[PDB]
Amino acid sequence: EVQLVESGGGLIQPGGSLRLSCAASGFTVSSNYMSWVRQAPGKGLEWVSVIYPGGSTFYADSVKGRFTISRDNSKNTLYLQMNSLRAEDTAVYYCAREVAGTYDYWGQGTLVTVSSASTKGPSVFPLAPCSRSTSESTAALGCLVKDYFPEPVTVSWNSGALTSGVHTFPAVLQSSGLYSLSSVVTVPSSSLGTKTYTCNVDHKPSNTKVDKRVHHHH
Amino acid sequence: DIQMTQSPSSVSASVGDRVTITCRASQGISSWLAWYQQKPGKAPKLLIYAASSLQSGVPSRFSGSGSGTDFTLTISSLQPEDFATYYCQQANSFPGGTFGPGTKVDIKRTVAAPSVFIFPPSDEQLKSGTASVVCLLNNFYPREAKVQWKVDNALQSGNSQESVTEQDSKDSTYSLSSTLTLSKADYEKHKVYACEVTQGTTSVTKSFNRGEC
Amino acid sequence: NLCPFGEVFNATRFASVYAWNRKRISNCVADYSVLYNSASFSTFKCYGVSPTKLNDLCFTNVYADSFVIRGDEVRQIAPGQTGKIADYNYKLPDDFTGCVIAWNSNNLDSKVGGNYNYLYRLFRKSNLKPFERDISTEIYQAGSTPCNGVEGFNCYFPLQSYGFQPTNGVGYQPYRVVVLSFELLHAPATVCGPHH
Ligand SMILES: *[C@@H]1O[C@H](CO)[C@@H](O)[C@H](O)[C@H]1NC(C)=O
């Protein structure tokens, strides 16, 4: 099993610097051509940098002078050091192993957000029907995860024991410049107030996790 | 300064259809051409290298052809899990690979009416001076549904935002969330909150009365 | 007695770059201006010497290295360059004294369906020293598992074909390259320009 595990992405002010890491197993980093490829939100893939087995390094015109690709043999890890970051650099950054110019294995990606806005943890509010008295045999419940920055949040239900019929929506950017999303689940209405439903909202960018039991609308 | 283009920019096709998408290089690149599939929120996955060779572990329904400037990726029998953006990539550029802009494939299927639910704002949120009213459209097809908010029978605009899940990997339906945002003050002025969902010539309205419930 | 540059420049076959050819040129008069003034060449660049003064110089011997690479790699055949060619195939030193000459060979060296004859070394763990030649074909170990001479996952043949097709963009078309190295030893000169 080849694994590329990336780390180090997060929020950074314009003109700031950040270093990404990509820990490899299943091939030897120093023996391989390794690249970074990025993808700005909703846009295509852009190759950004490569390091050759013999140590040569090359860079896209878009990042030349500002980025430095490097590796540590003992840790079998690839790095990308980025300086003078600007909004145009906001993207998910992937590392990839390259064989004859094609990328056969990729990391999971790490999000870099270049912004002068502050980290803001989410407010989690219940989604529950106005009245259970009028609930059909299937009821919907959920959590609204309001007013956070930057992306991303994850949502689980009952610590991952409840997965069937879960829908977690893509965040919308509000006019405030804060994100908001909902996560919903449908359940038997007969279960309501005999089974408990808790959404587990993780916002790693603010190091905050919220567990919120969803009650009848009060 | 090779330009890689792809056509069409999007295609909608039914399960079992043959799908053909095109990649063009602005100058000849021989067979130095790769294809990737990228699912929403995932890394690209290599499908095809050297224009026509299938990557280990990739299903046989994917195939590539062409050499020089014009390339094709074919899905012989589209599966519901095949919705994605598909990218070609020039594999012999220096210093780096050059990606095409991608073709987005979505799964076509029969209409499916949404299950519609409405949620009042929480007392907890109201305490802080804002009211979010949420409307869920669950498991429907097609994507295009008109969601209209009404407050005491007055049509809202400019104060809602929508978001959609990715197509179900089995039944190809969508779900949709619409959020209407009001001040607490505005919220408390009004009684009837209604989300009206129109597909074609059928509308379904779910509502609540702020006073009750 | 004129230097037989013809045997180098007009050879029917050229070497793959990984297996670059060297020919020693000695005991002759070298009219460099004939080559310099030629319409044949898309690159004619000299290092450590003035290209216009070549007909005036004496050297102990001249060496002619020749091979095929792609158009956009010709720029790697220069002091202080990096890339697959400079790193793993043909490396010039910082202090190089000589000339680099190249011309498009798409008409001779491309084939319909791709020419699979011309190779370069793709995989090598360290860069070549200047003027080093590596013609080995050991399976390259890209992981921690030994290859035991068998191609497969993380076990690569170290040479790759260019696959030159006549429809390739010019930067990807084959170019024939001749590198003239000018050698100065503590001995009588045997190669002099006619205007010395
Ligand atoms: C190669 O051949 C052509 C035609 O026979 C001739 O013009 C040219 O002088 C030869 N090149 C050299 C370097 O002798």
Numbering used by the authors:
A (entry chain A): 1 to 218
B (entry chain B): 1 to 213
C (entry chain C): 334 to 529
Show the paper's wording.
LY-CoV555 had substantially (>10-fold) greater neutralization potency relative to other identified RBD-binding and ACE2-blocking antibodies, such as Ab128 and Ab133, despite having similar apparent binding affinities, suggesting a distinct binding mode of recognition. The epitope recognized by Ab128, Ab133, and CB6 only becomes exposed on the RBD after its transition from the down to the up and active state of the RBD. Structural information was used to map the portion of the RBD molecular surface that interacts with ACE2 only, LY-CoV555 only, or both. On the basis of the crystal structure, the LY-CoV555 epitope, which has some overlap with the epitope for Ab128, Ab133, and CB6 described above, was predicted to be fully accessible on both the up and down conformations of the RBD.
